[PDB]
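Can't attach files on this board, so I'm pasting raw text. These are the components:
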Amino acid sequence: RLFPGAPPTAKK
Amino acid sequence: GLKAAQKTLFPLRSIDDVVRLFAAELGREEPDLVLLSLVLGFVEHFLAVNRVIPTNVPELTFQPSPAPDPPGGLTYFPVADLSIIAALYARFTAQIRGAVDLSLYPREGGVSSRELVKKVSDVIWNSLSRSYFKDRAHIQSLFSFITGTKLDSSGVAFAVVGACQALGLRDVHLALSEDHAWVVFGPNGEQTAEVTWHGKGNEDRRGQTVNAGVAERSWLYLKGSYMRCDRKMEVAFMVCAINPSIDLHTDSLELLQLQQKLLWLLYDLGHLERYPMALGNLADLEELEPTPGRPDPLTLYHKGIASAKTYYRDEHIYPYMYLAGYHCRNRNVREALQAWADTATVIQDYNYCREDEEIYKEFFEVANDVIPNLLKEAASLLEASALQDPECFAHLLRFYDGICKWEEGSPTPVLHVGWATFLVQSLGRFEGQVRQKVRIVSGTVAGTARGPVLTFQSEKMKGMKELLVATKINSSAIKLQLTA
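---
Top answer:
Structure tokens for the assembled complex are below.
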């Protein structure tokens, strides 16, 4: 996830 | 060039040296976005991209310093000479002032024309490599733009704003939704323009206004509730755009500290106030390596959520996913399901469309993979609890409720048979005993005069509130109910 400040994907 | 007050802070030989430059610059009226990005891109470059230290450059040096923990060691830091940074600052400044003639454009009393804004847009646009994958790390900074000529989606819009600052324009600011970026300008800042592509396929929407996306109620433009940045928030963005990641599994310890310290710096000066994502970013950072004396991640996630409610009509989604993710990690089942339910509650007032792909995928992984793998896990602890709590089963329906309400009035269908199988399997994970202590009331008395309760907002979910709370789960009927 490259958008600055976006959270990690919840999955693996 | 650089003012002398900027120059004297060089050179930077450590992380702390960098934090100083950022405090100093944040105290100015016009923080130098170009200067700051170049420093960030320079330090990210030698700490994430090329960790191998050059041997025939008498200009570039590295600063030895005591190892962080027991492991090792000497950590080396890329010293940012003034001459290196000044040369990059200079080349960027040249490029822009060269390509545009402020004479052809009369600034109407501190007002930048729209033709001027498109122009600066093109200058950046036409300056970048035709030959690269736009989906990788370490192409966000102006260092990347000036050195390799590569910029990722959001980085272009930041470049366009830094370029306007280089031309002394001061009304052109960074507009920021949760998965897209563009530009705002005019008097009182109600003019907008696309300046970059978005998503996998490069559909250039540039030159266009943003009104269309606000109108379609798509999550990309946040129903007109996106962030309009000031200079100080644009610095926060940069700090978020820092990418500590060296490999898929490996991260730069100094790039994590740097982003952490820089975020605290910002927090204290009240600059994260209106930036929910920066708050959550900072929260995640604290969970990994908490600095002693500071608040808890959990505190911070809630500040983020608070910020979204206050300043953006509680119309954002990430501040919850930040929270949900946290609980999901510390195996806090109930708080996970709640926070995910809150997320869906925000989404229900949006329409789904082609370019909302980033968030669709997130609800899909949560619904189809992350919740099932998480229930299945607890199905195995009480067999040797939350699977025995109607609040969690209610949290869950509220979740599928928000998603059904999302789908409503949307061009493309959200649900399909693939979602159904895991709804069926998740319900089945709960006892009829438990599913029945939840009452789905419509609303007894509207207003006020002078187990747990759940009320649906979507037609689908209320159309079948009986099959959900039954004892045999009619797999076949519940599936037919999620389609129309």
